[model samples]
Target: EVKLLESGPGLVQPSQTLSLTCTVSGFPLTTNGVSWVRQPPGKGLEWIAAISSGGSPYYNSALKSRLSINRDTSKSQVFLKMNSLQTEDTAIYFCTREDGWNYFDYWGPGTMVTVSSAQTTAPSVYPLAPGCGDTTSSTVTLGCLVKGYFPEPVTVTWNSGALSSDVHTFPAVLQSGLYTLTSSVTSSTWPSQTVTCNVAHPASSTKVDKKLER
Candidate 1:
């Protein structure tokens, strides 16, 4: 199976250069082109650069001055070097195989790079206790609010697992540069067994849990 894996430094200071590598297997770099794409926290994707099979490079017009794409065909790796970083440049970078139609086929699991001088902020999680709307009803909706987090990505789950059938997580809203997200889950077992909202962020190594209570 063809696979790509991205590796890079997790943190970079503002105004410094950032370097990342995409290592691939099951394909030869001499015959396949690789492209780089990045996504800032909670934002859309942005194409950065690409290296063709013939060893030519292509870049986005916006980042043309500060970006470079290269590869080591013998090593089966592609490299991306970008300079003059800023806090706004903090993003998760991914690499993919560029097809003849310029479509990305094989993709790598992105690596997040935080560009900043300040420390990352952990989110404050609040669990909204499920209300008893109808005493006869078997299901109740439980809510969790994750607020004030930096770098924008957080993992929220119920009972340590990602249960999605009856769960609804709204898009994260930016608030004063931080992010706030709300998620709700409707379950019939509320109060009978413990239900927990687990929040995981890069700022904190440990996962934060908010239990449902009255």
Candidate 2:
């Protein structure tokens, strides 16, 4: 088993450099290969950087320009450096070593990183089409799509206007390595325009409010 000694920064601003260190235990770093792997919430795994046992470093072509991999033989640690980050680059990074042919056997616990935008842009929120049978009269459904947020653990809430019925779907992963969450609320139409959709993100516990205008 492999372990990450020190993790990356929990929060980072756009264009800032991110440095993560992985100190290996129960394994020898000089005789084996190690690399950095990352997974955004609800996204597939990504291989970002690595170093061969002979100390040759490699990087994913997409991030080669901004990523660097290195290690300290004396400290038994591997290091990762990345620059010019954006919110879409946020993810949970893991440190792992190759143990088989083209496979990783030992893995490290992951650390979550969040890249914040310099400017504030709330997630896009809109209303999905109400179903047949005059849904506008019995209920109005609002769709709130929370996209391009950082750090994991986000939530959605529909404000009370009339019996506040909420139906939240699982978050979808984006190609940019971010997550998109869909949430909807069904309620009586008498107070249609008074409803609101609230998306709570882990970025310092901030919430984005989207008012219904139907």
Candidate 3:
């Protein structure tokens, strides 16, 4: 197995651009593309952009106007920049390879850059429609509130009164100019019940208490 890692400072400022490097080894540049990804401290990932092996770059249309990708092929490295950031932009950043064919076959371990420590912790919950119910041409769906935060490993676990160790967790990437990070955990909806989001840190205590009915 190959390894990749990100290296840089652990903190940044709001509306202040941040820059970090994704240093990777174990593979040749001739076989892959470099990519930049971020997530606000407590949010989900946002794909900033990608530079293919051929030197062509593709950016997220939502951020195309404010993001740029550059790299030195000889260094096997890639660079990222975004402008006009916000406090929520504080998160962990990562450099990744478009993993050979078309997937992120490998990724840097990630470098975290927090915006500020003055902030506190608060978890919010949002619920969508019922996850699975047999209805005639009816849509069955569910969702929860989306929040962003910086630094980890923060805890996001299911509090629905059901014992579950099979939760699905995914990393979040935030971008404006620099990068930040967070993660999201999702659970299937339970009828006549709700889900919760909780935070545990030295800063403060914050959690979301939500009761749902089906």
Per-residue accuracy of model 3 over 82-165 as CA lDDT, tens digit each: 676666776778887875675776777676666654434333344434436555333223334334443343344556435434
Clashes of 2: 0
Q: Write the per-residue lDDT of candidate 2 for residues 1-214, one digit (tens) a residue.
A: 4455546556778889998988888767777788899887669999999998777899999989999999996789999989888878778888888743645777777777777753332345454554465534565556666676554556677773345556655555544655567777665663634667776774445666777664
Q: Per model, how many backbone clashes are there?
A: 0, 0, 20
Per-residue lDDT, model 2, residue 198, is: 71
lDDT, candidate 1, equals: 0.84
Best by lDDT: 1
The most accurate candidate by TM-score is 1
Give candidate 2 regions above 4 Å deviation: 99-102, 117-214
lDDT of candidates 1 onward, in order: 0.84, 0.72, 0.59
Across 144-163, the per-residue lDDT of candidate 1 in tens digits comes to 99988765568888888845
Structural RMSD, model 1:
3.5
Ranking by TM-score: 1, 2, 3
TM-score of each: 0.76, 0.55, 0.52
